[PDB]
Design a binder for this molecule. Structure first.
Ligand SMILES: NC(=O)c1ccc[n+]([C@@H]2O[C@H](COP(=O)([O-])OP(=O)(O)OC[C@H]3O[C@@H](n4cnc5c(N)ncnc54)[C@H](O)[C@@H]3O)[C@@H](O)[C@H]2O)c1
Ligand SMILES: [Zn+2]
Length: 377
């Protein structure tokens, strides 16, 4: 079982099959409690909750008095990352027999929506209770589940109310990616490529070379019982864990600014195109625009911009606002240069790359609005 440290503790545990034969046992022995609360959505729970209920019972059977496992299922979608849902979960926890107390260990089984929501619930339940992250999406495995950043959204913005609350454990089971929708897997690759581009030209090269194999496995038709990533586990785990390790490294150390490469323009685009277009899709276009911005300022070589554009496309991500899929889903929406500048103002410090794997500076750089408007043209 591969382990990765974060903030001094060895909380990240990664491998294929953890959910089926490692987590329940580990929670009972390492996160001892009388009460375990599992929060997930109906899409994810319908697939993974049954096996775990059994793994838990078997693991708890030995302990005495045996602990309980309580399950809360939220509707899928970001609509659930709200004040009302947080309050409903808390009320439900307080309605148990007996009510969930300070020893409760909350299990966040899901993507960034469930992870953000669940972590925030854990942070304030009776002023704070332990929780673990069990990321089921690619973006969650390498980004959202690491760092302790929790929150909910309000009608005025994303993640505006929340808290920094570190999970006791982060179980990364790559088998969850076997059922993750193709579009979501691709969406998550935006963060993986971003991380390689700002830290390792060698890792970026590995991604370029593994693109066809991985995407093939993702788009593959699986037989009722076989594993989707059959003979490419080592490759997948390597590429995914490289991004999670970087995120962990950054969180454990201005350097975190680099993690926002592609997000200055990316977030501006998303503010306009969401919810039709996903975060990673917006950031992919953002990485291309920000790479072109650096080239405009003569900081990044054109050859480098081409590699970024092709690597993003090789994983199925859009590289321009003129992308066919984007326009089809955004019928009626348009990202005017002014609308994009307006959004970037509410964020100008953009992360600039001098070479793949090499940032211009160990932080975001200042850019004149004049130059930004030219790359958005
Ligand atoms: N905490 C942070 O620092 C941070 C960083 C980045 C993004 N985010 C947050 O992440 C959220 C987006 O999360 P996301 O992209 O993971 O999407 P998501 O959590 O909305 O999940 C996407 C969809 O996939 C389904 N799904 C998830 N895992 C599955 C699996 N293994 N098999 C089958 N279906 C599965 C879900 O039911 C859902 O419908 C946003 O709300 C954003 O604000 C937070
Ligand atoms: Zn992002």
């Amino acid at each position: 079982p591969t382990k990765i440290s974060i903030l001094g503790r060895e909380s990240i545990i990664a491998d294929f099959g953890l959910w089926r034969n490692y987590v329940a046992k580990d929670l009972i022995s390492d996160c001892s409690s009388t009460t375990y609360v599992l929060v997930t959505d109906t899409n994810i729970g319908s697939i993974y909750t049954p096996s775990f209920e059994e793994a838990f019972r078997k693991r708890a059977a030995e302990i005495t008095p045996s602990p309980r496992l309580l399950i809360y299922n939220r509707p899928p979608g970001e609509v659930s990352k709200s004040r009302q849902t947080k309050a409903d979960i808390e009320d439900w926890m307080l309605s148990q027999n007996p009510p969930c107390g300070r020893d409760t260990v909350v299990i966040a089984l899901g993507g960034g929506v469930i992870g953000d929501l669940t972590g925030f619930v854990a942070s304030t339940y009776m002023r704070g209770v332990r929780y673990v992250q069990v990321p089921t999406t690619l973006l969650a495995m390498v980004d959202s589940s690491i760092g302790g950043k929790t929150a909910i959204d309000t009608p005025l913005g994303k993640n505006l109310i929340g808290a920094i609350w570190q999970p006791t454990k982060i179980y990364i089971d790559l088998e969850f990616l076997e059922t993750l929708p193709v579009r979501e897997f691709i969406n998550g690759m935006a963060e993986v490529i971003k991380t390689a581009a700002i830290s390792s030209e060698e890792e970026f090269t590995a991604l370029e070379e593994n693109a066809e194999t991985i995407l093939k496995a993702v788009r593959r038709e699986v037989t009722p019982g076989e594993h989707r990533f059959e003979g490419t586990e080592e490759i997948l785990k390597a590429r995914i864990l490289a991004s999670a390790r970087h995120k962990a490294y950054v969180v454990s150390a201005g350097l975190r600014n680099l993690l926002n490469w592609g997000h200055s323009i990316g977030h501006a685009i998303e503010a306009i195109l969401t919810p039709q277009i996903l975060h990673g899709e917006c950031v992919a276009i953002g990485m291309v625009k920000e790479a072109e911005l650096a080239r405009h300022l003569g900081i990044l070589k054109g050859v480098a911009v081409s590699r970024i554009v092709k690597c993003l496309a090789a994983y199925g991500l859009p590289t321009s606002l003129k992308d066919a899929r984007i326009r089809k889903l955004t019928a009626g929406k348009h990202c005017s240069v002014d609308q994009l500048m307006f959004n970037m103002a509410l964020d100008k410090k953009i992360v600039l790359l001098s070479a793949i794997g090499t940032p211009y500076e160990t932080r975001a750089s200042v850019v004149a609005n004049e130059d930004i408007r030219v790359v958005l043209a």
